Paper text:
To provide a molecular basis for designing better drugs targeting polymerases, African swine fever virus DNA Polymerase X (Pol X) was used as a model for the study. As the simplest DNA polymerase identified to date, Pol X belongs to the polymerase X family and is constituted of 174 amino acids. In this chemical reaction, metal-ion A (MeA) is a catalytic ion and decreases the pKa of 3′-OH, facilitating its attack on the α-phosphate of the incoming dNTP, and metal-ion B (MeB) stabilizes the dNTP-DNA-polymerase complex and increases the electrophilicity of the phosphorus center. To clearly understand the phosphodiester-bond-formation mechanism and the metal-ion catalysis of polymerases, we designed modified dNTP substrates with a chiral α-phosphorus center (α-P center) using a single selenium atom, without affecting the overall and local structures, to explore the absolute configuration inversion and probe the mechanisms of the metal ion–oxygen interactions.
DNApre, generated on the DNA-I by incorporating ddNTP without 3′-OH, failed to attack the incoming dNTP (dGTP, dGTPαSe-I, or dGTPαSe-II), thereby forming the substrate complex (the substrate–primer-template–polymerase complex: nat-dG_sub, dGSe-I_sub, or dGSe-II_sub), resulting in the before-reaction state (without the bond formation) retaining the absolute configuration of dGTPαSe. In crystallization trials, DNApre-I (generated form 5′-CAGGATCCT-3′ with ddTTP, without 3′-OH) and DNApre-II (generated form 5′-CTGGATCCA-3′ with ddATP, without 3′-OH) could not be extended by attacking dGTP or dGTPαSe diastereomers in the crystallization conditions, which allowed the dNTPs to just bind and retain their absolute configuration. In the determined structures, the clear 2Fo-Fc electron-density maps indicated that these dGTP and dGTPαSe diastereomers were intact. As expected in their substrate structures, the Pol X active site captured dGTP or dGTPαSe coordinating with metal ions and pairing with 5′-dC on the DNA templates. The distance (in the dGSe-I_sub complex) between the Rp Se atom and MeA (or MeB) was 2.3 Å (or 2.6 Å), while the corresponding one (in native dGTP complex) was 2.0 Å (or 2.1 Å), confirming the interaction between the Se atom and the metal ions. As expected, all structures of the three substrate complexes captured the reaction state at the pre-polymerization level, and they belonged to the P212121 space group.
Author numbering:
A (entry chain A): -3 to 174
B (entry chain B): 0 to 22, 24 to 174
Write the structure that this text describes.
DNA sequence: CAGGATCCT
DNA sequence: CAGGATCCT
């Protein structure tokens, strides 16, 4: 909200800096968050020229760690403060090159990954259309899975691309989703 | 600000004839559709606020009742306001007090009254007991496997006894 | 469309 | 225990 606007390139340099610097405390132990479990989402992934904030999705190996990842987040040698922080969303105000920016951290479990990536990539208008179409065929789609009568629909997929095509829609790269 | 029980009762009495909503038309809220709930109904000597449940004749009016609430002969402001809860800061005498307005549909009335009467500790026990027999109780109804359990009850007393619990007057619930 | 964190009810 | 309003995501 109050955070400064970033250029796409500014955002990419922040993500790159953070890729090696995130960690969390787990019952005392300090566990590094692997760069490969950090997916850049939001307008940055859609490669928009200006961004209101930086959105990172964190992929967590086991459900037991959800309690601990965002609520005990750490960033090596970066000045920041917490706006709000639960298990699924944490909003930080970070200091970067003498400016204050909003950094949004989200968590997905490994089995949720492609649904999460699809959700947090957006844009909002695109997701409303996609979900409404699935709603007319009696499905509910969210960031956790595809559902039918409050029951998980177990799709045999791994990637976002595979998800979208399994949902019965045309795949477009993030940049071309409107 | 904190109220005595009697202060609270005089506020409710004043408001009983003064609530209305728009909606183009201005519709009076009947005193008989206004139930005092919360610690006032439990007759606690001191209260943190005044809680009133408003009973709505039809579901189509939910959109309009609290979101277009009006009070004749009173100065106030809205804190927050949705279809189910509206919180007002009212001027009474020479003081500011919190007034909480809740809505229940007619078919929900006894569930709402039971919920908003409390106290919280009592409701947690009651609901946990029903949870062990696979029911869910809330302010809207009694449910089983995401299906409304159609008890044909009218009053709160009838509800509690139908739920299989001992009826106690609000003052003695704990 | 769908859901999350906060601070309540 | 179970859920609501606000302002986000
Ligand atoms: N389903 C759904 N998802 C949303 C909604 N708002 C945001 N999201 C998801 C998709 C977004 O790409 C992601 C990040 O939200 P942001 O508000 O940061 O928007 P985005 O990053 O797209 O642009 P911006 O930060 O404004 O440059 O969260 C919503 O109303 N519904
Ligand atoms: N199920 C449930 N009901 C609640 C909860 N908190 C409040 N309520 C309901 C029952 C309460 O009697 C009613 C009014 O809440 P209040 O916070 O105003 O407490 P109460 O009025 O009993 O005392 P006070 O207002 O503090 O004098 O709302 C809760 O956590 N769970
Ligand atoms: Mn963003
Ligand atoms: Mn109260």
């Amino acid at each position: 909200s109050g955070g400064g606007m970033l250029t796409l390139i500014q955002g990419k340099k922040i993500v790159n800096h953070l890729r090696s610097r995130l960690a969390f405390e787990y019952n005392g132990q300090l566990i590094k968050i692997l760069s490969k479990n950090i997916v850049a989402v939001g307008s940055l992934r859609r490669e928009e020229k200006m961004l209101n904030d930086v959105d990172l999705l964190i992929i967590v190996p086991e459900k037991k760690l959800l309690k601990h990842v965002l609520p005990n987040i750490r960033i090596k040698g970066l000045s920041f403060s917490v706006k709000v922080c639960g298990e699924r969303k944490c909003v930080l105000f970070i200091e970067w090159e003498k400016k204050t920016y909003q950094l949004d951290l989200f968590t997905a479990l490994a089995e949720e990954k492609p649904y999460a990536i699809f959700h947090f990539t957006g844009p909002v208008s695109y997701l409303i259309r996609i979900r409404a179409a699935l709603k007319k065929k009696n499905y509910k789609l969210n960031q956790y899975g595809l559902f039918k009568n409050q029951t998980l629909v177990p799709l045999k997929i791994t990637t976002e691309k595979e998800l979208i095509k399994e949902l019965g829609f045309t795949y477009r790269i993030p940049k071309k989703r409107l």
